[PDB]
Amino acid sequence: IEEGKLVIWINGDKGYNGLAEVGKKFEKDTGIKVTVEHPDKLEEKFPQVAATGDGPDIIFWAHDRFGGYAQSGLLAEITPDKAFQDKLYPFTWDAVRYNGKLIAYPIAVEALSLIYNKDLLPNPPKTWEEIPALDKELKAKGKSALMFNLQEPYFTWPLIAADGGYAFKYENGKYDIKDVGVDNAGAKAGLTFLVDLIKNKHMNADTDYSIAEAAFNKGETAMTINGPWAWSNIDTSKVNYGVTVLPTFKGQPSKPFVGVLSAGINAASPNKELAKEFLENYLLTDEGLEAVNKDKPLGAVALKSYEEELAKDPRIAATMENAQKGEIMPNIPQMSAFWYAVRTAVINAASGRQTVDEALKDAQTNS
Amino acid sequence: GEELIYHNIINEILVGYIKYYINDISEHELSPYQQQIKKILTYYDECLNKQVTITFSLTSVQEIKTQFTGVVTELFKDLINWGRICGFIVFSAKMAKYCKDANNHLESTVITTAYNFMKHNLLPWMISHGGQEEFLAFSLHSDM
Amino acid sequence: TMENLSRRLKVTGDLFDIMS
Ligand SMILES: OC[C@H]1O[C@H](O[C@H]2[C@H](O)[C@@H](O)[C@@H](O)O[C@@H]2CO)[C@H](O)[C@@H](O)[C@@H]1O
């Protein structure tokens, strides 16, 4: 928006204060002010304002939305040399590759894990099926078993894919936007199990991110499903928590969608050359990632040198275990329509506004 | 939404010129935008005719897809720039006029084939480099 | 001959691009 200045967008649940400290260091060396912002509905606002030539110089988000940004002509292409590419894991470069070209810098790998209060529960349930009973146990104590965000399909998908649900079929190197696994046997089995947990009064269809966060941190509930960014507030709350494998559904592991936090450069930015400097030489160093990680954990970072340290953290290992059992999100432009559709279906099945079979049939159609 | 933004861009830059070159429409039916870029496209066509006389032999949908795709993928494998888009546009127009003049009924397949390739393989670059405003400015700068 | 036409389309393309 302004030559001589950097504006950076990152979602509110990340370490935007840590990233601002890396911005201060950048301003110290170059005199370029770095403003970090965390707008609401970020993944949606950027394509709106970027399409008219506005928005941030740099946009942060999971990789799945960038292929759509790239196809809409909203992203400048990045120009990291092989030397710099060698500092990040190749598989993280693969998440930001689109139509042959790198379209963003990978930051860190993110996956949902099961988070549990050890005092309330020293033996996390291996299966989803034993939760309803363990909930009536805890609800006699005054507590509850599980509270996690129901308003975003990201947190419900692991249970949906467990029994066979999928987004787009991956075969020979091309994604089939005609073959969609949102309304197949597995998906409706996983979603129905969620609705029944709601119907049977175990969970609450109104539960969102803030609700589930406070309930857990305040020890009102025994378990939650979340990613690395959320551990800080749990440290602050002092709850004795463990991070472990997601429960299985019908003997098969929860299959969470794996995300790779990525940074793109607005095609309309008059500061591309300085955006490259900041991202490669200031952010993606052992020091830049530490600054962000100290505010909110990034997960398993792309930077080899710094991931070597973080990998030893057991909470990070559980993230990678649930990650192997999951799958990397596709970045094709159709990923937005898939999420929108799955967002509407999960919300409608939980609220009773639609049958499972209805909700998912609509989602299969509108994907 | 955005499916329609892609349509209007491609139609202003690609389709309008082809339909004029084919005589499906008259110059008067071209938008002021289309009338401007037509000049640089016309000069490219002249410059190309002085080099080569293209002889087309297309009898089916598949031959059009294969041949058209082969030419234009090599045109842009190296890189993309507005001058080459001029060549893309003019090339599409020549294959389409061969079809209409041959009376093989395949001209709509050439247009559609070029529409689809521009949509997926060129439009990201076009938009990320100023889109319509810059192609028009490119064509007006060439007026020198 | 087809690869010849694409080469020609490149040159006169690059030509028109520089002359602007
Ligand atoms: O770090 C990942 C980020 O996104 C999660 O999931 C998003 C997804 O990444 C987007 O593509 C979106 O369209 O769908 C998901 C929400 O249903 C979580 O939303 C978020 O907590 C997390 O930070």
Author numbering:
A (entry chain A): 28 to 394
B (entry chain B): 3 to 146
C (entry chain C): 106 to 125
Task: Please give me the paper's original passages concerning this structure.
ASFV is a complex virus, encoding for at least 150 proteins, which include an arsenal of immune modulatory proteins and virulence factors that includes the Bcl-2 homolog A179L.
Clear and continuous density was observed for MBP residues 3–367 and A179L 3–146, with the linker residues AQTNSSS presumed disordered. A179L adopts a Bcl-2 fold featuring 8 α-helices arranged in a globular helical bundle fold. However, the region that is the equivalent of α3 is not helical. Instead it is found in an extended configuration, mimicking the corresponding region in Bcl-xL. This additional ionic interaction is supplemented by further ionic interactions between A179L D80 and E76 with Beclin K115, as well as hydrogen bonds between A179L N83 and Beclin D119, A179L G85 and Beclin D122, and A179L Y46 with the main chain of Beclin L114.
